[PDB]
Design a protein around this nucleic acid. Structure first.
Ligand SMILES: Nc1nc2c(ncn2[C@H]2C[C@H](O)[C@@H](COP(=O)(O)OP(=O)(O)OP(=O)(O)O)O2)c(=O)[nH]1
Ligand SMILES: [Ca+2]
Ligand SMILES: [Ca+2]
Ligand SMILES: [Ca+2]
Length: 341
DNA sequence: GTTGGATGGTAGT
DNA sequence: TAACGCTACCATCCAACC
């Protein structure tokens, strides 16, 4: 089994540099302006020049501008980046039809039937990197290993503009030596719980009682880590099937007034239903981000598909329930559809 | 006993 | 000082169903 994982470098910012090459070589910050006041919002991503100074995905735009007042600030044009992404995913499908698109900028290819060893895989990785450069002028990072998890780890190690193979001997080394916090799916909360248990490396999961591990981090995470530690993780590459589709928007000002919130909620439903593209959902959830940035939701699953008209009717009832059951003001409001027929 | 929807936690991007 | 946006998968609680 040979898996090749590709992740596009500083993606949104890189696309903007392709579209305007005078930007290349200096700080570029792509921003999600929320409209609440001038420069309210968050950074979607920045190029590596901006990252040197701490400007990166998730920080407030006002904070970025405090640090780098003279950087180029651009509004997120997600439809444009999606056009580029879709073209690159099509390029990748020419190298293998067994492709799992995992995000707007990354995919796993099962290349087992396309190459015979890691030497051939590495050369295919370079061909892929060259193809994407020729066609789209986008640099990417490639990770290659025996499964999805280690191909991802390989790319994480090699970025930006990298290519890295983690062969069988290195997999066994990493099971002993890799900080378990750097394993995909282990965030800060799980990492701290593992630490308390004295689990610092994957190999350490083999000498703790499963019941103790399970009790602390849950059954699914425990089984996942053990499978990796035994070098028996074998999750197949599978075609991505979207399970939910939604939109959430930021309100100009916080509110508990139904008629004030409704316009935003309806905008979210319209954009959401458009996104559905022939999909027919049986479940709807109204999602509210409260004034203190907590996320609350109310939902309903129907025995049949939900028409746009039913989505309008039901969403108001769900927003009403949130208001009735939660005293706090609402800051962001939206909808998510799921359980597609 | 057992499912599985409602709601939220965790992760990552 | 400010905190967008989107999606996946898992856990818990509890009403409905064996
Ligand atoms: N709105 C928004 N978009 C994000 C956020 N994080 C990532 N994205 C978008 C913009 C990124 O360019 C794109 C791909 O995510 P990545 O995690 O792979 O980061 P990126 O490619 O920008 O940097 P890279 O060199 O991988 O580190 O997805 C975020 O917090 N908010
Ligand atoms: Ca990336
Ligand atoms: Ca990525
Ligand atoms: Ca981590």
């Amino acid at each position: 089994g040979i898996v090749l994982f590709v992740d596009f470098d500083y993606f949104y910012a890189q696309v903007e540099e392709v579209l305007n090459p005078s930007l290349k070589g200096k700080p570029v910050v792509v921003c999600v302006f929320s409209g609440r006041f001038e420069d309210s919002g968050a950074v979607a991503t920045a190029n590596y020049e901006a990252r040197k100074f701490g400007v990166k995905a998730g920080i407030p735009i006002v904070e970025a501008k405090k640090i780098l007042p003279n950087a180029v600030y651009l509004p997120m044009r997600k439809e444009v980046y999606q056009q580029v992404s879709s073209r690159i995913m099509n390029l990748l499908r020419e190298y293998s039809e067994k492709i799992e698109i995992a995000s707007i900028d990354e995919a796993y290819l099962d290349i087992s039937d396309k190459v015979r060893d890691y030497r051939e895989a590495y050369n295919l990785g370079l061909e892929i990197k060259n193809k994407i450069l020729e066609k789209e002028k986008i640099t990417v990072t490639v990770g290659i290993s025996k499964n999805k998890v280690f191909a991802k780890i390989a790319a994480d190690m090699a970025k930006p503009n990298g290519i890295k193979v983690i062969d069988d001997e290195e997999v066994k080394r990493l099971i002993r030596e890799l900080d378990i916090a750097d394993v995909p799916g282990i965030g800060n909360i799980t990492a701290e719980k593992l630490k308390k248990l004295g689990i610092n490396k994957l190999v350490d999961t083999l000498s703790i009682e499963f019941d103790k591990l399970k009790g602390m981090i849950g059954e699914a995470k425990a089984k996942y880590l053990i499978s990796l530690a035994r070098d028996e993780y074998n999750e197949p590459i599978r075609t991505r099937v979207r399970k939910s589709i939604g939109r959430i928007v930021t309100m100009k000002r916080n509110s508990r007034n139904l008629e004030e919130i409704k316009p935003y909620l309806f905008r979210a439903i319209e954009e959401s239903y458009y996104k559905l593209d022939k999909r027919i959902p049986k479940a709807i959830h109204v999602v509210a981000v409260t004034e203190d940035l907590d996320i609350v939701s109310r939902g309903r699953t129907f025995p049949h598909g939900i028409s746009k008209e039913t989505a309008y009717s039901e969403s108001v009832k769900l927003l009403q329930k949130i208001l009735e059951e939660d005293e706090r003001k609402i800051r962001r409001i939206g909808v998510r559809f799921s359980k597609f027929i």
